[PDB]
């Protein structure tokens, strides 16, 4: 009942910003370029210093011409529109957004603790209580996002940052979409795709619950439930209706994962009449105090070593490329609302 009340007020706040988005809140000249944190299909993320405050931020840079070539215009507009409107403890904050002749810029809070991905690969795997701690934060985040009619569509350890208190922040809203009915875009990461996406069906928020099953399995095993050298071989594994669990997985963990990694939509947890409560009330989460997680009162199982607000030791090294700004405006009409 308090969840319904909290979400009702959360929806009112969201809808005001969704209907009247913040636009052009900074300029490139207000930032000092420090280091490239990463490059991917998401363009590039740069560590920057905001000169007026001395604050460090992670600046996502997208080339307008490349977005157009990749047919990602609508997805990029969704990303910025959604990010500027949301407000949740486990979501990365969009601090500023702007564009120039060549690029789009999204300035986000910087998490020097780095991606869950890097820590997970290095350590190998997380114990069940450690994995449960992160999984509970995802459960609350999807409960929040789904109540706003938002589908996330890109859950993976690469998209989960570890904050200075050991809690997570979901980043990368590149495929996030506000949709009341079903949708059809083939998007996401091969290992995390629900069978309904692979089989070109209309799908809904249940794909995020399947992706949660893949994440929990990956955190607890150290490898994903479906892996192979090529995406096609991964797709065949996903649709086969077969999953194998390590012998160290508890009975409760296996039961929860068979209900999340469920090919049948009428049977998938998160998608039934009781919605998110089928997950929250599962035996694997019996020790989880949901309010205490939300309030960040639970002691985190792992805290990244603090080496300063601008330290990059948790990120890999990338070739440093220029930020070129053409003298001519590119794709003006396409990115008018950004």
């Amino acid at each position: 009942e308090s969840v319904k009340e909290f979400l009702a007020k959360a929806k009112e706040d969201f809808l005001k910003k969704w209907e009247n988005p913040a636009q052009n809140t900074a300029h490139l000249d207000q930032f000092e370029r420090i280091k490239t944190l990463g490059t991917g299909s998401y363009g590039r993320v740069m560590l920057v210093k905001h000169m007026e405050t001395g604050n460090h931020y992670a600046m996502k840079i997208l080339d307008k011409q490349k977005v157009v070539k990749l047919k990602q215009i609508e997805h990029t507009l969704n990303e910025k529109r959604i990010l500027q409107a949301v407000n949740f403890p486990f979501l990365v904050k969009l601090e500023f957004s702007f564009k120039d002749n060549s690029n789009l810029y999204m300035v986000l809070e910087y998490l020097p603790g780095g991606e869950m991905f890097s820590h997970l690969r290095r350590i190998g795997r997380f114990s069940e209580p450690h994995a449960r701690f992160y999984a509970a934060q995802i459960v609350l985040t999807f409960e929040y996002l789904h109540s706003l009619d938002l589908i996330y569509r890109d859950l993976k350890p690469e998209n989960l940052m570890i904050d200075q208190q050991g809690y997570i922040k979901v980043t990368d809203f590149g495929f996030a979409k506000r949709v009341k009915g079903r949708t059809w875009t083939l998007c996401g990461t091969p290992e995390y795709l629900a069978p309904e996406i692979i089989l070109s069906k209309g799908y809904n928020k249940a794909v995020d619950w399947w992706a949660l099953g893949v994440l929990i399995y990956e955190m607890a095993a150290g490898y994903p439930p479906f892996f192979a050298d090529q995406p096609i071989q991964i797709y065949e594994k996903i649709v086969s209706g077969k999953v194998r669990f390590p012998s160290h997985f508890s009975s409760d963990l296996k039961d929860l994962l068979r209900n999340l990694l469920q090919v049948d939509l009428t049977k998938r947890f998160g998608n039934l009449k009781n919605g998110v409560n089928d997950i929250k009330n599962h035996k694997w989460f019996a020790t989880t105090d949901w309010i205490a997680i939300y309030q960040r009162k639970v002691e985190a199982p792992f805290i990244p070593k603090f080496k300063g607000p601008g330290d990059t030791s948790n990120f890999d090294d990338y070739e440093e490329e220029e930020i070129r700004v053409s003298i001519n405006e590119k794709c003006g009409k396409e990115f008018s609302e950004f």
């Binding site: 590149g174 998007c187 290992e191 892996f227 390590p246």
Partner: peptide, 19 residues
């Protein structure tokens, strides 16, 4: 072991999104 199979695979690094 499955761990050894994963480690020897080409997909242990950061995975790119598809569209």
């Amino acid at each position: 072991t499955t761990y050894a199979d994963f480690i020897a695979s080409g997909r242990t690094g950061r995975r790119n999104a598809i569209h």
